[PDB]
Design a binder for this molecule. Structure first.
Ligand SMILES: *[C@@H]1O[C@H](CO[C@@H]2O[C@@H](C)[C@@H](O)[C@@H](O)[C@@H]2O)[C@@H](O[C@@H]2O[C@H](CO)[C@@H](O[C@@H]3O[C@H](CO[C@@H]4O[C@@H](C)[C@@H](O)[C@@H](O)[C@@H]4O)[C@@H](O)[C@H](O[C@@H]4O[C@@H](C)[C@@H](O)[C@@H](O)[C@@H]4O)[C@H]3NC(C)=O)[C@H](O)[C@H]2NC(C)=O)[C@H](O[C@@H]2O[C@@H](C)[C@@H](O)[C@@H](O)[C@@H]2O)[C@H]1NC(C)=O
Ligand SMILES: *[C@@H]1O[C@H](CO)[C@@H](O[C@@H]2O[C@H](CO)[C@@H](O[C@@H]3O[C@H](CO)[C@@H](O)[C@H](O)[C@@H]3O)[C@H](O)[C@H]2NC(C)=O)[C@H](O)[C@H]1NC(C)=O
Ligand SMILES: *[C@@H]1O[C@H](CO)[C@@H](O[C@@H]2O[C@H](CO)[C@@H](O)[C@H](O)[C@H]2NC(C)=O)[C@H](O)[C@H]1NC(C)=O
Ligand SMILES: *[C@@H]1O[C@H](CO)[C@@H](O[C@@H]2O[C@H](CO)[C@@H](O)[C@H](O)[C@H]2NC(C)=O)[C@H](O)[C@H]1NC(C)=O
Ligand SMILES: *[C@@H]1O[C@H](CO)[C@@H](O)[C@H](O)[C@H]1NC(C)=O
Ligand SMILES: [Ca+2]
Ligand SMILES: [Ca+2]
Ligand SMILES: [Ca+2]
Lengths: 612, 15
């Protein structure tokens, strides 16, 4: 190859030829704002970079074609990033989220590798032929750490170091190199952190570092330079280019920097998702976050039960497992103000209301197949609840004050509730019994009400002891209805019939705005307190703080694994009972058909038609 | 640009 030196500065990535020593040219990119960490992939000569202003990781070819953003969510300060050229994996470290993560080079199958007791991981270096990765930490007590490249066997390699940067492996000579930003030194050690040596002690401000053949290269922010010296003696110092202020990173682009082999290089280890290098020449198959590795040690299966919780501009997933796996952002594009969420466990698709767009939208959990279900004539959806058997979304409309019903593919079913003085807000459906529950925020008269799923059999359950009942949940197994009142700052429950009303919690609650049932636990979100909390409906283990310091909480929704055999025993799950619009569970074990308020049931007693 | 400086640090062309 032609050996190239690439460097980031401001919003540009530029290249200097190392055989001509002075030919400088910018990579023709658009949309970069703050270019930071750099790497490349030897097999296709793609370049990769992070951006601290956009909080993204992107890749492109050096002529600017195939510009793609491969990581776009869940980053804060992605200051370290490296390409695993053998397994075709992308690694990065974030000083904001305190995480080291991996994905495929196109961003698929993101997994969190290190997150516990991690204080600002900054500079990252990979050795996939051996199976180790190395990084510096800038938090608390700075240090250089080592782990397997599946995140296991984490150990401290260099304990006595300042904030360090430009961590670089000389793969040929088995040396580590870095700059110390607190002592302004360039140092080297062997792969075990031993045989330490100071390479240069007379540089005022060495920031970035890399290595190629007999030379180390660095940037100096006080000398506004990229410079080069003999990697063992520190001599033969030369100026690669001057008048370059604040160069954030430098990278030697040459195939000799990415050599070697591991099993991942040949058929990805027969791994379905990730092939991760593990120490001394090994490999292990890995899975996206919250997935599990099957008994064949090669294939991954998605989680069957989990918790979803939304913020203003993010939807997250949480699992309750022994590993205490971290929560993960879902990579759903174009969220602006998420107000409410739901999930279809049949087709495994997430649904949400965005009150900036006044839209109901849906996508798969990996963020693909984004689709608009409801859109504007002025609508303003407030809450939504899916009937998974008839395959309908029930949702409340704040502008027109109706309950409207829509098929999962966007075709409208119709409104089932409307009254001049009605203000339907929170809603949850119980298709197992044929009922729907909603809060009704009438002026000076808030209510909790229930009705059949076609709007008939409407009755007020509760009208006293309510100020702003803002969220509803229910559980068929427990046979219970749950609500939060953000004004009275308390959580209540009753039987689904409305009997046995009881306050569950009213202490240390500031602004409860959502709640959900997961097995025997009632979870809720406290917006003002920035917390998720849960309580045990059996009364045995009490009340637990699930996660704190979560800003802009908007909704929470638990997903239990679908019992497919049991699902298909619901009468409305088979062809909607033959009903064109609404299928009602009678309670006789039988089903009758019904219609939205603008249509009439026809003679076949299955079809709805336009009124005479 | 200049987010990194804002966290860890100023230069011109920043703000
Ligand atoms: C913009 O750049 C991209 C990326 O190029 C990469 O970066 C530059 C800076 C150089 O270092 C490139 O060498 C490097 O690959 C260009 O897309 C490149 O273009 C390469 C050719 O210039 C092309 O490489 C050729 O691949 C042939 C087959 O190999 C496979 O091809 C398919 C099946 C894919 O699976 C590839 O991933 C895989 O590598 C291979 O036969 C060629 O070897 C030589 O080709 C001749 C030069 C000949 O003289 C023989 O010596 C021998 O047969 C190989 N050529 C080289 C030079 O390596 C590479 O596949 C492609 N990248 C991708 C991802 O497809 C892009 O070029 C444009 O697109 C190309 C597809 C091609 O049409 C090219 O002519 C065209 O200009 C650049 N765009 C613009 C505009 O210039
Ligand atoms: C309940 O929700 C549905 C959306 O799921 C609303 O249906 C939409 O209603 C509007 C206005 O009635 C329709 O616009 C119409 O489009 C036709 C296009 O041929 C045009 O000729 C009309 O003049 C009008 O602009 C819109 O198409 C329709 N969308 C769907 C998917 O059916 C419905 O209005 C809501 N009901 C209530 C009472 O709010
Ligand atoms: C960088 O410095 C090292 C160390 O002085 C040089 O290594 C010497 O290389 C010669 C071959 O030319 C050997 O005969 C010596 O034994 C080496 N010295 C040591 C101490 O190992 C190296 O040549 C220098 N490289 C450049 C490009 O100047
Ligand atoms: C999948 O991997 C596990 C773990 O490496 C294998 O279980 C190991 O089996 C060997 C011998 O069969 C034992 O010595 C280890 O102690 C086992 N480890 C554990 C954690 O149980 C398992 O056999 C592999 N299965 C397949 C199909 O490859
Ligand atoms: C680097 O400096 C040493 C010591 O003066 C010298 O022996 C060597 O030839 C120099 N290398 C180059 C490439 O100039
Ligand atoms: Ca931190
Ligand atoms: Ca809900
Ligand atoms: Ca909920």
């Amino acid at each position: 190859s032609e050996a190239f030196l690439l460097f980031s500065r401001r919003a540009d990535i530029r290249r200097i030829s190392l055989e001509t020593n002075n030919n400088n040219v910018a990579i023709p990119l658009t949309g970069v704002k703050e270019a930071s960490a750099l790497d490349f992939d030897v097999t296709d000569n793609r370049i990769y970079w992070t951006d601290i202003s956009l909080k993204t990781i992107s890749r492109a070819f050096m002529n600017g074609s195939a510009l793609e953003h491969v990581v776009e969510f869940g980053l804060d300060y992605p200051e370290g990033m490296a390409v695993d050229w053998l397994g075709k994996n992308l690694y990065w470290a974030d000083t904001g989220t305190n995480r080291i993560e991996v994905s495929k080079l196109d961003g698929q199958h993101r997994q969190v590798l290190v997150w516990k007791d991690l204080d600002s991981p900054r500079a990252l270096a990979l050795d996939p032929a051996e199976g180790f990765m190395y990084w510096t930490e800038w938090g608390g007590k700075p240090k250089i750490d080592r782990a397997a490249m599946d995140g296991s066997e984490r150990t401290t390699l260099v304990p006595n170091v300042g904030r360090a940067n430009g961590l670089t492996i000389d793969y040929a000579k088995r040396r580590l190199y870095w700059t110390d930003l607190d002592t302004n030194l360039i140092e080297s050690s062997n792969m075990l952190g031993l045989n330490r040596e100071v390479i240069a002690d007379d540089l005022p401000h060495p920031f970035g570092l890399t290595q190629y053949q007999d030379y180390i290269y660095w940037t100096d922010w006080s000398r506004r330079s990229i410079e080069r010296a003999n990697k063992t003696s520190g001599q033969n110092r030369t100026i690669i280019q001057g008048h370059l202020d604040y160069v954030m990173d430098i990278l030697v682009f040459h195939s000799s920097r990415q050599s070697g082999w591991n099993e991942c290089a040949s058929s990805n280890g027969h791994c379905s998702h990730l092939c991760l290098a593990v120490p001394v020449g090994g490999f292990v198959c890995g899975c996206p976050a919250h997935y599990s590795l099957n008994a064949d040690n090669r294939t991954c299966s998605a989680p069957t039960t989990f918790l979803l919780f939304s913020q203003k501009s993010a939807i997250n997933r949480m699992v309750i497992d022994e590993q205490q796996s971290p929560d993960i952002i879902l990579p759903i594009h174009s969220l602006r103000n998420v107000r409410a969420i739901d999930y279809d466990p049949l087709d495994k698709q997430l649904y949400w209301i965005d009150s900036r767009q006044n839209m109901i939208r849906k996508a798969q959990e990996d963020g693909s197949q984004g689709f608009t279900v409801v859109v504007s004539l002025e609508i303003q959806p407030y809450d939504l609840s899916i009937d998974i058997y008839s395959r309908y979304i029930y949702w409340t409309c704040e502008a027109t004050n109706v309950i409207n019903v829509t098929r999962l593919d966007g075709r409208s079913v119709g409104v089932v509730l409307k009254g001049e003085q009605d203000r339907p807000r929170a809603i949850v459906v119980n298709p197992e019994k044929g009922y729907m529950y909603f809060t009704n925020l009438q002026e000076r008269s808030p209510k909790i009400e229930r009705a059949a799923l076609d709007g008939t059999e409407r009755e007020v359950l509760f009208f006293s002891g309510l100020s702003k009942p803002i969220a509803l949940a229910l559980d068929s197994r427990l046979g219970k209805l749950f609500w939060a009142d953000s004004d009275l700052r308390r959580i209540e429950s009753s039987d689904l019939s409305g009997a046995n009303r009881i306050v569950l919690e009213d202490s240390n609650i500031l602004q409860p705005v959502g709640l959900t049932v997961f097995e025997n636990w009632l979870y809720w979100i406290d917006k003002q307190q920035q917390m998720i909390e849960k309580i045990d409906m059996t009364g045995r283990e009490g009340r637990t703080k699930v996660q704190a310091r979560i800003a802009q909480l908007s909704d929470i929704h638990a997903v239990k694994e679908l019992n497919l055999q049991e699902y298909r025993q619901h009468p409305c799950a088979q062809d909607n009972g033959g009903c064109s619009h609404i299928c009602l569970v009678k309670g006789d074990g039988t089903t009758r058909c019904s219609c939205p308020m603008h249509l009439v049931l026809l003679q076949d007693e299955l079809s709805c038609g336009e009124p005479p | 640009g200049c987010r990194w400086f804002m966290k860890w640090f100023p230069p011109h062309w920043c703000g």
